[PDB]
Design a protein around this ligand. Structure first.
Ligand SMILES: [Cl-]
Ligand SMILES: [Cl-]
Ligand SMILES: [Zn+2]
Ligand SMILES: [Zn+2]
Lengths: 198, 199
């Protein structure tokens, strides 16, 4: 059993606890500076014919690299997910993810999602923060998404291949992983208590 | 047409293919992460003959020493940066165009169409950390034996530039001269290599 938060203690995510059984190596063994390269092969979107602007891909990749750097050094929970993902996939170069810079937040983890992406692994990010914001439910009321939480959320999708909807849990394993990590990073935003907004 | 630093040993009959390459790779600024240069350059283990597989433990030993050499070269040598950066824009940013590391095998790099014909069209860079006669090179201070720093850099310059050692009207070739320039910028004591083959 690994660290958790008080907001998860009643009805913890079983799929997260199932995954904690697999990813047990919480030691820092990968170069924080190269986590972006281990994760991403190059630019790529959900639809293959649609090309990604080179300059946006560079803007997302650089901020991403810094978030992976901060997350890996401060959060033991994140290292376990990263380290395990390296043994299974990311050490192999052909099994890395495409970065859909500029496109809508999402990660191809479902058999349907891969059928929609021509069987291509994509993780779409954007910096539409500098518009209508997205909000999430907290014990302190709705809070706006910061790019740290948005990015981490989609990354946890990629490292774990888990989805947000979980039977009998209001958050799902990805949100809980995201919550655990951001707190270990010293992130102030309050935890997300439910996947769906009201 | 902006000539870059050279060595006193090259000014008479400088390598034209090196100076021709200096015109293309002109960005000497440090923009890549030195710690990840090995990842940009090498995808994984792989040898000259495809059926021959590489020992897992040896590949790790070469890749680790390599990573440290590229780190040293990239941070200290501007000439190396121009070659590394230029190689990144053209090929290594693309993941399918990266090199295989033939750890343990004899020093060599597939840069000629013939070399590729022998490797079934696979890009490989063979290194080793290995009785027989040691290897020596020509210097103004007499024969010198190769250190792994020079051996690795030499083969890497083959990969970054796709140039070969054989040059008409030059005794060294562009790869050797690049290697000499770089090792001096890295503060390497060994004397420059004045000729490819002994004369
Ligand atoms: Cl989502
Ligand atoms: Cl050679
Ligand atoms: Zn999600
Ligand atoms: Zn050579």
């Amino acid at each position: 059993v690994f660290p958790d938060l008080p907001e998860h203690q009643d009805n913890p995510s079983q799929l997260r606890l199932q995954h904690d059984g697999l990813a047990t190596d919480d030691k820092a063994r990968l170069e924080p500076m190269c986590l972006a390269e281990y994760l991403i092969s190059g630019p790529g979107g959900m639809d293959p014919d649609i090309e990604i602007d080179d300059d946006t891909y560079d803007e997302c990749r650089e901020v991403l690299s810094r978030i992976l750097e901060d997350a890996y050094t401060q959060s033991g929970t994140f290292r376990r997910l990263m380290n395990y993902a390296y043994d299974q996939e990311l050490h192999d170069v052909e099994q890395r993810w495409l970065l859909g810079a500029g496109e809508n937040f999402g990660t191809t983890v479902t058999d349907e999602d891969l059928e929609s992406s021509e069987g291509r692994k994509v993780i779409a990010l954007n910096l539409d923060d500098t518009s209508i914001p997205e909000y999430y439910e907290s014990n302190d009321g709705p809070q706006q998404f910061d790019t740290t939480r948005s990015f981490i959320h989609q990354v946890v999708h990629a490292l774990t291949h888990l989805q947000d909807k979980e039977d009998s849990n209001p958050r799902g394993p990805v949100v809980e992983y995201t919550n655990i990590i951001l707190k270990e990073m010293g992130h102030t935003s309050p935890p997300r208590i439910a996947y769906e907004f009201s």
